[PDB]
């Protein structure tokens, strides 16, 4: 997964550049991690894939 379910952050598109400066397309995927998030304490878990930026923030709970 390369899309965050909270902030919608997706992959960027750019180039891998060789020493000969040949540039081929590649992606910069967000650091998407699976979380089992809860809405209220003790509640049912829901599987999301969110970026480590949202995990570092308080956007999700476990």
């Amino acid at each position: 997964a390369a899309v965050c379910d909270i902030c919608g952050k997706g992959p960027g598109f750019g180039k891998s550049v060789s020493h000969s400066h040949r540039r081929t397309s590649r992606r910069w995927d967000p650091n998407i991690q699976t979380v089992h998030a809860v809405t209220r304490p003790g509640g049912n878990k829901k599987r999301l894939n969110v970026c480590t930026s949202c995990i570092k923030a308080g956007k999700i709970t476990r």
Partner: protein
């Protein structure tokens, strides 16, 4: 982030005081189990 721990956590602190942990311990063990909360407004309630 800093957590005010409501419960008593061994070699981590007693009730009420604020203690800083390495952010994985807090959000994967302390917050889920109600042992601690994040310090935003609780200082005024404690004092």
């Amino acid at each position: 982030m800093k957590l005010i721990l409501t419960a008593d956590v061994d070699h981590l602190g007693s009730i009420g005081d604020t203690v800083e942990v390495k952010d994985g311990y807090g959000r994967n063990f302390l917050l889920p189990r109600g042992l601690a909360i994040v310090a935003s407004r609780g200082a005024q309630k404690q004092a």
